[PDB]
Amino acid sequence: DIECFMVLNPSQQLAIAVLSLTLGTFTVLENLLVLCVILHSRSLRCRPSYHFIGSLAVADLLGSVIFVYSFIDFHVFHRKDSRNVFLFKLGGVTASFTASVGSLFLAAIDRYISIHRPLAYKRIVTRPKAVVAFCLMWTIAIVIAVLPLLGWNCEKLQSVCSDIFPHIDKTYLMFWIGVVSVLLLFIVYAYMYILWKAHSHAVAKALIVYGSTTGNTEYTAETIARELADAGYEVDSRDAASVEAGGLFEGFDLVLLGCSTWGDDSIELQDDFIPLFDSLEETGAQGRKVACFGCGDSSWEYFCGAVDAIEEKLKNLGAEIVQDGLRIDGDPRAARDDIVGWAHDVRGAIMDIELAKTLVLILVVLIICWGPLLAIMVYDVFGKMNKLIKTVFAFCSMLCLLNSTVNPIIYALRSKDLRHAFRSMFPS
Numbered sequence: 001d002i003e004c005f006m007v008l009n010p011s012q013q014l015a016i017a018v019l020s021l022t023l024g025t026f027t028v029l030e031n032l033l034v035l036c037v038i039l040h041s042r043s044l045r046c047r048p049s050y051h052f053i054g055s056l057a058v059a060d061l062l063g064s065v066i067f068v069y070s071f072i073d074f075h076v077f078h079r080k081d082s083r084n085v086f087l088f089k090l091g092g093v094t095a096s097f098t099a100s101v102g103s104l105f106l107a108a109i110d111r112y113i114s115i116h117r118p119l120a121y122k123r124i125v126t127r128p129k130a131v132v133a134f135c136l137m138w139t140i141a142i143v144i145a146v147l148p149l150l151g152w153n154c155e156k157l158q159s160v161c162s163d164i165f166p167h168i169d170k171t172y173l174m175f176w177i178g179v180v181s182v183l184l185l186f187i188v189y190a191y192m193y194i195l196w197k198a199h200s201h202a203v204a205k206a207l208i209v210y211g212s213t214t215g216n217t218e219y220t221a222e223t224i225a226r227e228l229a230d231a232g233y234e235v236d237s238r239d240a241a242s243v244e245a246g247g248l249f250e251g252f253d254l255v256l257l258g259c260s261t262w263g264d265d266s267i268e269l270q271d272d273f274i275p276l277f278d279s280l281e282e283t284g285a286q287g288r289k290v291a292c293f294g295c296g297d298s299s300w301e302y303f304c305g306a307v308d309a310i311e312e313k314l315k316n317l318g319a320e321i322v323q324d325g326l327r328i329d330g331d332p333r334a335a336r337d338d339i340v341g342w343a344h345d346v347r348g349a350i351m352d353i354e355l356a357k358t359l360v361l362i363l364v365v366l367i368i369c370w371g372p373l374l375a376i377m378v379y380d381v382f383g384k385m386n387k388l389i390k391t392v393f394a395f396c397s398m399l400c401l402l403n404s405t406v407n408p409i410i411y412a413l414r415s416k417d418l419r420h421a422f423r424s425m426f427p428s
């Protein structure tokens with residue numbers, strides 16, 4: 001019975017008509033304009049491809065037109081269609097909107113690969129490869145929407161029918177959910193991965209291993225760490241007496257070695273610093289930015305010779321010395337300006353927030369639009385559908401149009417080349 005699938009409340013039909021026609025027309029005119037500026041940009045600029053932006057516009061323009069027409073016709077006009085004709089109209093909507101998420105899926109792959117393997121990115125993502133991928137992605141989407149027409153429906157299969165969608169075997173619906181859920185979850189994973197990855201590299205991490213006996217070099221390290229705390233470093237200052245040599249510097253943009261000079265007859269390192277000094281090769285110092293500091297006294301012939309021995313092994317082990325050592329004579333509290341001045345100099349030698357906002361918005365948009373829609377379908381596969389939920393679905397089906405309306409704003413508007421191409425269409 002076709003009439004069981006219809007929102008029949010006249011007040012509800014009107015709201016369905018208002019939202020559908022308003023959003024659909026804005027969506028049609030938006031993506032139409034995007035396609036217009038794509039083709040004008042290709043007239044004057046050879047370099048920007050617009051593969052993702054163009055594909056998404058075609059998918060949304062086609063989908064909104066087929067949807068809004070069939071949707072208004074079915075719910076407001078109560079078209080009783082032959083089974084196959086209805087599946088045909090459903091097929092267009094399914095292919096276009098499945099193509100829309102596939103386009104978002106391929107763009108997500110492009111960005112994920114850029115972050116995951118930035119050097120190899122120029123080999124794996126090529127203009128010839130992208131053309132083939134988008135062509136195949138579109139083809140798969142059409143084939144997925146043609147099976148009910150070919151006979152993957154409940155009437156020919158003699159199986160349970162969907163309560164949400166007329167003439168739809170539940171197994172086909174469950175299959176279609178799994179395809180879209182995998183695409184959507186990867187898009188979620190990719191961008192969540194990118195946010196995590198960017199967050200770690202945002203703030204630099206500093207590592208101060210200090211060896212002091214009477215607390216002088218500790219006071220220097222603590223005075224140094226406080227200056228780096230103001231600049232927004234993630235400082236971990238460790239007494240040398242309690243450290244693991246292996247991988248000690250792992251994951252640090254900057255390492256600071258503060259040792260005291262303690263030679264009675266000849267130069268000697270501070271005792272707690274000595275086991276760490278012997279195991280420098282194990283610390284993975286090679287290729288790391290390091291600076292040295294230390295306390296001492298001018299009365300002794302070798303002024304801060306400990307800072308000399310360390311830098312000589314670090315420069316030999318391959319760590320890049322950012323600056324020459326910091327050498328203090330007498331109480332460091334007297335030279336506090338020289339200490340804090342040093343931090344600034346060594347700090348001197350060496351987030352993409354706007355991007356971060358955009359990625360979160362997409363995920364918020366995606367979760368808001370596809371989430372509730374798919375969940376109701378999951379219900380229909382397993383449980384029983386009452387009139388209330390059917391009604392909710394009709395209004396939730398409108399959520400997809402919204403996604404089609406904001407997509408030009410999210411991506412096309414954000415493209416620098418497109419804005420230059422739009423301005424190009426004016427006399428100047």
Ligand SMILES: Cc1cc2nc3c(=O)[nH]c(=O)nc-3n(C[C@H](O)[C@H](O)[C@H](O)COP(=O)(O)O)c2cc1C
Nearest residue numbers: 212213214215216217260261263295296297300304
């Ligand atoms: C036996 C002895 C030997 C020292 N030898 C040196 C030295 O060779 N070169 C130097 O600059 N200072 C030398 N000093 C001075 C110390 O490095 C000074 O006290 C330093 O500030 C200790 O600070 P700390 O508490 O951080 O270890 C020596 C001090 C002592 C008691």
Ligand SMILES: CC(C)CCC[C@@H](C)[C@H]1CC[C@H]2[C@@H]3CC=C4C[C@@H](O)CC[C@]4(C)[C@H]3CC[C@]12C
Nearest residue numbers: 051052054055058062092095096134135138142
């Ligand atoms: C309405 C649905 C069911 C059928 C759609 C048929 C036509 C419109 C489809 C089939 C193949 C599709 C093309 C396949 C490849 C791409 C490359 C992409 O970077 C821009 C879109 C573009 C050029 C597609 C445009 C739309 C397209 C030509």
Ligand SMILES: CC1=CC[C@@H]2[C@@H](C1)c1c(O)cc(C(C)(C)CCCCCCBr)cc1OC2(C)C
Nearest residue numbers: 070071074089090093094164165173176397400
């Ligand atoms: C009852 C009913 C009659 C007209 C239907 C209408 C449902 C409908 C709908 O409610 C939701 C969707 C979407 C936008 C949510 C896509 C659903 C894709 C499902 C794929 C697996 Br069956 C498509 C839409 O297509 C038409 C033909 C207008």
